[PDB]
Design an enzyme around this catalytic site. Structure first.
Site, PDB file in Angstrom:
ATOM      1  N   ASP A 154       0.820  -1.200   0.000  1.00 11.69           N
ATOM      2  CA  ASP A 154       0.000   0.000   0.000  1.00 11.69           C
ATOM      3  C   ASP A 154       0.861   1.261   0.000  1.00 11.69           C
ATOM      4  OD1 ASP A 154      -2.881   1.126   0.686  1.00 11.69           O
ATOM      5  OD2 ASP A 154      -1.544   2.055   2.160  1.00 11.69           O
TER       6      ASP A 154
ATOM      7  N   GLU B 175       1.252  -0.365  -4.936  1.00  8.01           N
ATOM      8  CA  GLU B 175       0.298   0.697  -5.235  1.00  8.01           C
ATOM      9  C   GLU B 175       1.043   2.025  -5.212  1.00  8.01           C
ATOM     10  OE1 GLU B 175      -2.007   2.384  -2.223  1.00  8.01           O
ATOM     11  OE2 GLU B 175      -3.832   2.622  -3.446  1.00  8.01           O
TER      12      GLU B 175
END
Ligand SMILES: *[C@@H]1O[C@H](CO)[C@@H](O)[C@H](O)[C@H]1NC(C)=O
Ligand SMILES: [Ca+2]
Ligand SMILES: [Ca+2]
Ligand SMILES: [Cl-]
Ligand SMILES: [Cl-]
Ligand SMILES: [Cl-]
Ligand SMILES: [Cl-]
Length: 562
Positions: A202, A273
């Site tokens: 993330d 990401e």
């Protein structure tokens, strides 16, 4: 001989919305396990789960209070093991969501940090700011949070500001602290020890910020793309993104994964990401001396393709990714996730099959956001039922600009209660109103349907031509994107995507040297009336608007390559 991931199909499960198994209206691990066989049947290789760890759900799992624990309503460690064991039987690789940038502000480390505990005082990024004129407090820098407002939050108990690049409930970990560095790669080992095939990581661009110089943090310069000083885009993120130490830590993490890959000839993979510039996405692949992520998400495409993009526009961003990708790295294609409006709603409901065709026939790695394979659409949700803090931090007048909830509604399995997602009276987010006529079961029985087109693509791409073929991209006019993928002595595939509203003749002879007056139809958009497997004239065939077709010509056999 490809490694398992290089031509892989990856599917993102949003566990809260995939399948309820225990009647609380919340998707859970046992629910995922019931549905893994479905994921194998539609051609998936890797299954990535969004945050399943202990978290107060302020950001619905991305605010983690214990990286070594399953969140209660999702299950326990046994429920995880059954999920993992089921993946192993089916031959699916399990990918977990790793959220290193921040913890919940309910995490024990943060509570102890606030109290200046000797061990955790420095786990987070604290700074006192400066008292200013008129007894006012000036924050340590002018940095802006991704969710708007200052990324510094005053804590009265500790008498300092802590850094939050995301929500104030998500305090940033201080990766300049070696104790933090070690602790977070032991989180990776904890789950690698328990059998996972890798991680989706993330918010990688935001890991490191620049350090203090002379007791101060450096401000960022205005971007002049907006006048709104609460909008993160107000600033150029020279100090809070893309830092060189960020890439160093990605490479350190890949080395931990590689330790496990050596153990058992099963490559651990990393997805990242990174909503940042294309060169800074590319740098995540690795550098001269060190590998990074095998799959840094191709957000160059997702961030730039819009509802009114032309075929030429789509080609520009595809070509930009390919031109920037190093020869020794694999492409990936992704057009949906839990932070974007669903693909059909976002890019045009008529283009659902066109875009699934593109995602599945472009080279290497194809990503599917849950429900994209049945053409799910966003569901408008009233202000009172919305839960996404990006919406609730807005206002009743305008939360729909910001809310991610419309794209997070329960997966539509069948026409029964709650679309077969749950037996509960209420689900955590509402089931979309279309569910009786848009669900897996109904598409499964139909002659032509998004799911049958999807399934045809994930099977056909695993044959030698789409597995091993080159790519040769051509644009006719503004809206006819065509590309050829060839394997010598085997054959070639032609994908034709008509982004425009008008029907158009392919005229392939005026686009490629390559002849073959006729090619065989492999698959087409739902509205195309041309039956599968017939032959068409490559010059005169008329592709209807907002539609795609996959065409084949074989010199030899085109076997499934395993
Ligand atoms: C496409 O939409 C964007 C945003 O809604 C707009 O700024 C742009 O001008 C549109 N393009 C055309 C050609 O109208
Ligand atoms: Ca449940
Ligand atoms: Ca950070
Ligand atoms: Cl249930
Ligand atoms: Cl690689
Ligand atoms: Cl096939
Ligand atoms: Cl023929």
């Amino acid at each position: 001989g490809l490694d398992w991931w290089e031509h892989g199909n990856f599917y993102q499960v949003y566990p809260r919305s995939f399948k309820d198994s225990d009647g609380d209206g919340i998707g859970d691990l046992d629910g995922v396990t019931e549905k893994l066989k479905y994921l194998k049947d539609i051609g998936m290789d890797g299954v990535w789960l969004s945050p399943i760890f202990s978290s107060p759900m302020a950001d619905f799992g991305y605010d983690i209070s214990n990286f070594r624990e399953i969140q209660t309503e999702y299950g326990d460690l046994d429920a995880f093991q059954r999920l993992s064991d089921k993946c192993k039987q089916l031959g699916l690789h399990l990918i977990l969501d790793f959220v290193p940038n921040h913890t919940s502000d309910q995490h024990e480390y943060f509570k102890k940090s606030v109290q200046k505990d000797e061990t955790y005082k420095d786990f987070y990024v604290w700074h006192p700011g400066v008292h200013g004129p008129n007894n006012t407090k000036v924050p340590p820098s002018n940095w802006i949070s991704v969710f708007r407002g200052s990324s510094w939050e005053w804590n009265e108990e500790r008498q300092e500001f802590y850094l939050h690049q995301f929500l104030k409930e998500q305090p940033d970990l201080n990766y300049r602290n070696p104790a933090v560095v070690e602790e977070m790669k032991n989180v990776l080992r904890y789950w690698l020890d328990r059998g996972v095939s890798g991680f989706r990581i993330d918010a990688v661009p935001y890991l490191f910020e620049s350090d203090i110089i002379d007791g101060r943090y450096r401000n960022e310069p205005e971007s002049r793309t907006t006048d709104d000083p609460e909008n993160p885009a107000y600033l150029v993120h020279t100090q809070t993104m893309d830092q060189p130490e960020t890439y160093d830590m990605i490479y350190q993490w890949r080395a931990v994964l590689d330790e496990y890959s050596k153990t058992d000839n099963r490559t651990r993979i990393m997805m990242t990401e990174g909503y940042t510039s294309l060169p800074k996405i590319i740098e995540f692949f690795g550098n001269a001396t060190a590998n990074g992520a095998q799959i840094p998400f191709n957000f160059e495409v997702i961030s730039n393709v819009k509802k009114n993009s032309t075929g030429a526009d789509f080609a520009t961003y595809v070509k930009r990714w390919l031109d920037a990708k190093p020869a020794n790295r694999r492409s990936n294609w992704v057009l949906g996730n839990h932070d974007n409006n669903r693909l059909g709603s976002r890019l045009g409901e008529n283009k659902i099959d066109l875009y699934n065709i593109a995602l599945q026939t472009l080279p290497d790695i194809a990503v599917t956001y849950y429900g994209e394979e049945i053409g799910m659409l966003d569901q408008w949700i009233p202000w009172n039922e919305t839960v996404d803090p990006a919406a609730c931090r807005s206002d009743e007048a305008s939360y729909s600009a910001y809310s991610r909830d419309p794209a997070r509604t329960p997966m539509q399995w069948d026409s029964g209660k709650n679309a077969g997602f749950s037996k509960a009276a209420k689900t955590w987010l509402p089931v979309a109103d279309n569910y009786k006529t848009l669900n897996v079961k109904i598409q499964d029985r139909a002659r032509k349907s998004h799911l049958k087109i999807f399934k045809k693509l994930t099977k056909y791409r695993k044959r030698q031509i789409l597995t091993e073929g080159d790519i040769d991209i051509k644009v006719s006019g503004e809206n006819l994107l065509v590309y050829k993928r060839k394997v010598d002595k085997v054959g070639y595939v032609v994908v034709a995507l008509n982004f425009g509203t008008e029907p158009v003749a392919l005229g392939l002879s005026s686009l490629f040297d390559r002849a073959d007056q006729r090619m065989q139809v492999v698959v087409s958009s739902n509205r195309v009336s041309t039956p599968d497997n017939v032959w068409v004239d490559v010059d005169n065939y008329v592709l209807i608007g907002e539609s795609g077709i996959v065409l084949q010509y074989l010199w030899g056999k085109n076997p499934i390559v395993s």
